């Protein structure tokens, strides 16, 4: 019928994709952490900070096949596209039967007294069977478990102060009914079954939140283009828009800017330290003016 | 202002930004987080229109 109708919407599409990452050519020391001479006892796990590097995770697949590689807050295959603010590697060796406890929300001897993950956990749990390196016919000192604790552990709370069990109803120093050596050692032989053989575990905790980041995946930078509708990725922050010179006076501390409705409207370029405004690409509704198809097929 | 402000809410999702959900997760998980955002944003539009 004759009239004006609203049909679909129009959008200006981007013409190119611009990705900007900092001047970092240093590789992350994942091989030093995974290819350890020795792994820390689970009761006293070794936390290694990873910073100022490219988190190229292909080296992890080069290191070993894996028993378990389960990511909770991220995809295991998109880790090289992401950029992380703070990455920590918790390295320890545990009994295979306890591997299922290295997960958010779990309980058991390890989740309760040696190493606990928070419920709000973003990261990856990586494990492999290390029997050929850690088991010995005479036993070893790699396995230590804090069987008894006055209270359960909080996530990432390390406590290596050992005294004596308070299992009984009387204070004592080693009395067998009421007191046991606070930290137990266990000996393992290469002939033990799959559930008793040692496994090497590395937990990668990723604070994948907010503006700062020291470690970005292996992306290749491109040139900047201003005053055009483009796709972009700034240190993991992605979107579509027009990048223009900004007149906002950001403090050296401030890195991103936001509007009154908490949307991103400015970024700092990781190499130039230029502040760029983000303008959305033009969009709007499309209306069609029709004389009516019983008169003419011309439309505006 | 309220309708726009609602876009920053998570509605139980891991993140309020849709591009970050797609950037971080594989489709099977992204669909769950996205459905949470769709439910919240659609409910916000119906409230606005009513």
């Amino acid at each position: 019928e004759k009239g004006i109708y609203q049909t679909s919407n129009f959008r200006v599409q981007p013409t190119e994709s611009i990705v900007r990452f900092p001047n970092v050519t240093n590789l992350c020391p994942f091989h030093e952490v995974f290819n350890a001479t020795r792994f820390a006892s689970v009761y006293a796990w070794n936390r290694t900070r990873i910073s100022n590097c490219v988190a190229d995770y292909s080296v992890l697949y080069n290191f070993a096949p894996f028993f378990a590689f389960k990511c909770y807050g991220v995809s295991p295959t998109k880790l090289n596209d992401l950029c992380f603010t703070n990455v920590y590697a918790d390295s320890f060796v545990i009994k295979g039967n306890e591997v299922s406890q290295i997960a958010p929300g779990q309980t058991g001897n390890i989740a309760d007294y040696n190493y606990k993950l928070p419920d709000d956990f973003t990261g990856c749990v990586i494990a492999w069977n290390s029997n050929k390196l850690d088991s010995k016919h005479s036993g070893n000192y790699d396995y230590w478990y804090r069987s008894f604790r006055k209270s359960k552990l909080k996530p990432f709370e390390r406590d290596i102060s050992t005294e004596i069990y308070q299992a009984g109803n009387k204070p004592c120093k080693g009395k067998g009914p009421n007191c046991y050596f606070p930290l137990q050692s266990y000996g393992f032989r290469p002939t033990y079954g799959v559930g008793h053989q040692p496994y090497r575990v590395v937990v990668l905790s990723f604070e994948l939140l907010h503006a700062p980041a020291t470690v970005c995946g292996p992306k290749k930078s491109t040139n900047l283009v201003k005053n055009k509708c483009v796709n972009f990725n700034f240190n993991g922050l992605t979107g579509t828009g027009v990048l223009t010179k900004s007149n906002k006076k950001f403090l050296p501390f401030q890195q991103f800017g936001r509007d009154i409705v908490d949307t991103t409207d400015a970024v700092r370029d990781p190499q130039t330290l230029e502040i760029l405004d983000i303008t959305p690409c033009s969009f709007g509704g499309v209306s069609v003016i029709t004389p009516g198809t019983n008169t003419s097929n011309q439309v505006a | 202002n309220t309708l726009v402000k609602q876009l920053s809410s998570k509605f139980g999702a891991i993140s309020s930004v849709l591009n970050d959900i797609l950037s971080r997760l594989d489709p099977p998980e992204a669909e769950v987080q996205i459905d949470r955002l769709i439910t919240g944003r659609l409910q916000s539009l119906q409230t606005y229109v009513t």
Binding site: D259, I260, V261, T263, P280, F283, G284, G285 | N1, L3, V4, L7
Partner: peptide, 29 residues
């Protein structure tokens, strides 16, 4: 003598109460 040809009172009424708005332009027009 004034643009818009409004009366003095209409001009006052128009001045007391307060076309692309960048704010809120997230699909809402």
């Amino acid at each position: 003598s004034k643009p818009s040809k409004r009366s003095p009172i209409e001009d006052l009424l128009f001045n007391k109460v307060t076309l692309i708005c960048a704010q809120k332009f997230n699909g809402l027009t």
